[PDB]
Amino acid sequence: DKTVLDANLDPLKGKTIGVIGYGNQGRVQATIMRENGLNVIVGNVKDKYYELAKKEGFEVYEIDEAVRRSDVALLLIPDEVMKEVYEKKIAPVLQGKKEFVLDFASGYNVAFGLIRPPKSVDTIMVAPRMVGEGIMDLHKQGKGYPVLLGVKQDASGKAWDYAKAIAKGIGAIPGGIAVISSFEEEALLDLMSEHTWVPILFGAIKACYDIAVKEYGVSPEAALLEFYASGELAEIARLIAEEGIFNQMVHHSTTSQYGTLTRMFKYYDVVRRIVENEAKYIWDGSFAKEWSLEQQAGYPVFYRLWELATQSEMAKAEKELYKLLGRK
Amino acid sequence: DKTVLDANLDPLKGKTIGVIGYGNQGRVQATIMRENGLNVIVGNVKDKYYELAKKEGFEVYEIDEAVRRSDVALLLIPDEVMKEVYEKKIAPVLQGKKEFVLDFASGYNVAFGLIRPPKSVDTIMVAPRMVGEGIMDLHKQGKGYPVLLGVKQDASGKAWDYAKAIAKGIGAIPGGIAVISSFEEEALLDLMSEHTWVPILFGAIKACYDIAVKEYGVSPEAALLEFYASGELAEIARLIAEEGIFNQMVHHSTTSQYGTLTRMFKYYDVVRRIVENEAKYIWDGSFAKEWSLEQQAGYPVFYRLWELATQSEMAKAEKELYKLLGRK
Amino acid sequence: DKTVLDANLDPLKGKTIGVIGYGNQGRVQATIMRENGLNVIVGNVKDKYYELAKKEGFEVYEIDEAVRRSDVALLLIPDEVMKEVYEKKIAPVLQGKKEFVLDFASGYNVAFGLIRPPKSVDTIMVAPRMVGEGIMDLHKQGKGYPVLLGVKQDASGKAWDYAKAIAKGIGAIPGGIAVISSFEEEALLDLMSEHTWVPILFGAIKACYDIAVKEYGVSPEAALLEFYASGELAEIARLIAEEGIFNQMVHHSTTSQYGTLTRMFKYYDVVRRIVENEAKYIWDGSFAKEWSLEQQAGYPVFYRLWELATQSEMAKAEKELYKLLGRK
Amino acid sequence: DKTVLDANLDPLKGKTIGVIGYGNQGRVQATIMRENGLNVIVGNVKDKYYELAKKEGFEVYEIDEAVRRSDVALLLIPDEVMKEVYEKKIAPVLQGKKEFVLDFASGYNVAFGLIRPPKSVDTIMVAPRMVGEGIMDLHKQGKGYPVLLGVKQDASGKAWDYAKAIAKGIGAIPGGIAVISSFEEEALLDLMSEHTWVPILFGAIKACYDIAVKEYGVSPEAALLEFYASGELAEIARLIAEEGIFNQMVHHSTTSQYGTLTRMFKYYDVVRRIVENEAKYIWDGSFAKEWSLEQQAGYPVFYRLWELATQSEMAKAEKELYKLLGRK
Ligand SMILES: [Mg+2]
């Protein structure tokens, strides 16, 4: 019901479009939406990406200049620097506009109020769910891919139309799909993954290694081979994305199935509590405060943790081992 | 003992006075103290208030220029911007002075050390306990009103005299009274109210609504009417300010008296613990740190909480209802 | 919605109506419904009110005599004496009736079974949500006001019609509204207010005073001025009833908003537990037992608590102060 | 300080005095104050005491009649029946008085509001601290005894004088002393003894017996002889009232002193908690409610406890023993 499969592409025809940043995402979106017959430009500072974009056939300007010539803009840059760029270069140029559009690929800076555009602007979001390299690898096959849509400020009653038009312009549909959501329901999701199961998985692996080594006389080389130094995990991820998460286990032994199911239903509430706590810590905006303040301080905890992680015994053992199998 | 009812007004005669800001407070204080025969000026940036003040018959200058011409100054601006104003415009002009006076209406920025004037300056405080509109509504009747006094730095042995003179000049006494206190005993009080019983009251009301609706099948319209959508509370506030807090209940039914008294003496320690915790959190200066850091981050929690509060079910129901009774 | 805005007034025309008690409500409800052209009488014992009632143009009889002449009755007396009056004077006269109506303004004595009329009677409830003095202060403007409706026993299939007719007859609609509810959903609400947030507020204020005085060396006069001796609370109640509870804070400083919101969302569960406990204690009928038993004992706890509250330090300080400001 | 040793006796001369009840107290107070030259009468119902009083030379009337003839009255009857007597016979006769006095020997019924005389009456209290026989046994020697004084309602500015006059009239001073206090400070004291150390002592004795018998094979006769069947406790009480509580132990062995002191300082907080709880339960009026409600039910708990206590194993054994030593 809340799903979309295709839509029109007329509202973007005759209008000019400007892309900010020429990294992976921006490069991909621009290279694609140029094929569908759209006047496109690029805004960026004079660096490597500037030369690359000018080589690939794109007329380039400065950001403030690119926004002047454009009726629509894509702010495809990291969430850690977008704030200053918007405050210094964009907002001034933008106060003197009449009817404009502003698209994002992440709702972090907007959902939490770090960027508050005027009311004369249509604020939208188009969030892909892919790495960026495989995207192009799928467009050559004529395939699409999934995205999320959202609207924060509607001043023309045409926002959703613009969002679906953009979605079509970048090769996401038809072939893939597009879901309608909010700026909050995207940041919340992107952050819950980085906070709940990735670190839990890593800590579980590390603890298994430490226990096996310091309580049962196991050697490091075998622990690493069993846990992650082999490619058993990539196979599982593949079978999951292809056949399903539970149907994947049918290709394993009965003993593994029994143990996995029992221990999954046994430890479900514990992780549920953690997920509740973290989702609550996010929904309120505390994590954004924490991260911004650590930025303003000089990334000391970042530094110390990056150190403690690399100087761990497991990391040294993995270094010695990878050197033995030819892996750089 | 610690109370005052009237005092002299001579030390301010012959001296020039400058008022910073022409908002709610400054406007009133200036308009009044001009009637009592005092050379008064105004300092502010060119905006609406500047036009209003130059209209009402006040000679205006730039802030830095007003302090040069003045021997006394009233810093009547919000506590959230006073710091930069003082650091940039006032302090430079102030190092090259001989004998000066500086008055505040709040001790937040001084009690916690965010503003540390020199030792060649007399630092005082005169804090009213009124809204600002009712003040003028009382001066026309020849009435006064209550204020708090305080001194942080005395370089002339005359501070208290200056403070009482100011109090008299703004029509607080005679007719009202004036209490002597500290910059700390004013911020502490102004904050304990905003941290202990206001939020507790609001949360209790919200919880009553939620419980009544989701556990006893009550309709929202009736809950809102009983709790706050009727002016029952304003009557209680009036009778409290007029006759007293306990003597107010004599006009209620015996059942209400019994229940209220029992449940008040039953839940006294719980709230006492909360009040202790918050007063301790304030006395040390942690809240100032918290608030300043949230300012430096971009008000993310402010934003998210303002959202969560308005998007609550009770707020939507109140919106639907107020629309039905004609209340805009 | 269940809401009602206007209805007919025919079923009461030709019938006679009798009002019991001539206090605030009775004096109010009777005059209005007389203005709308209804044969009305009054029942009361020979006392002060009797003289006033016979003065204002109402033909008076004894209570038992008023019900003989009446086809409808309004039992507008305190809930603490209604029981004996009903048991001695009304019920006997009422066993020998054919088709009757009985209206209440409170569902306390009926919701809990302290009054169980026969099955040959229509039992209803019309509960206003106003003080009683301001009611006429709105009827003079041609305005209405809100009420709650309920039915306990229907013997004519016309109960709701009679209830809406009454609502119209007393000037509640049109201009106000009328909600349909039960005798339980009215007593529960009237009691939850007197048990949850009023006493909590009072205890919080008292605790703030005690702490500030006995742990930070503050003077009583300043504490009283900050907390409630000033009319800050009345303005809050006004803006709440007018603009809304949350939209009210927009007129306060950002610091106050931040602190209030944080501490409200921080202490929400604590008060929720209390509200749950009290609502449960009420829904079962325990409080009715408690209150009916304290009467038979002689109101000892009532007495001792009324004493302890007035002999408190805060009360003595407030007495000394109010005497200093002219407040009687 | 708060002590008194003697005072005048004039205000009671020329006035008539009436005594209610001729039991232990009344028979004494009246008998004495007749010797000091005071017109005295008695009010009581026709029984045993009425015959005794008319025999001893006192003119007797009915209660209601005695108050008509008296300007002062002593309500010396049990606290369990005074309420009805006052409500039926006294209060009516008392509304039509001009200047009257009412004296009590206990503040239970007044401190808790079970008796609320008018404002045209002086309400006082004179509480002895003796059994009633020893009072005469000392008066025969020209000695006094101690009492407590209190005033609840003063309408002539002469109450304290009347109280001291009464004290002198009954032979309490000179020879003894008189303390000034309140009705509350007398009820609280009279009740704390009956709730804290008497029952604790009894329970400790019972537990010692039970333990010694059911865990160490001791015989009942020896346990009873050691604990209380011997009059050692009476000698302890005597030496306490005479020499002091601690100085009493000097006549015991060092081992006893050491053990007693150690275990007293070891178990002090435990009993302190109990005393706090009970004093709080009293100060609020809960015990009055409890006791007034057990009467209306029919004294069931009283009955069952009186049974359980007498049918205990300790009470039976005591029976055989007391029968063996000649003690009836
Ligand atoms: Mg991410």
Ligand SMILES: [Mg+2]
């Ligand atoms: Mg992700």
Ligand SMILES: [Mg+2]
């Ligand atoms: Mg404030």
Ligand SMILES: [Mg+2]
């Ligand atoms: Mg305040």
Ligand SMILES: [Mg+2]
């Ligand atoms: Mg009520």
Ligand SMILES: [Mg+2]
């Ligand atoms: Mg209410």
Ligand SMILES: [Mg+2]
């Ligand atoms: Mg006793």
Ligand SMILES: [Mg+2]
């Ligand atoms: Mg005793």
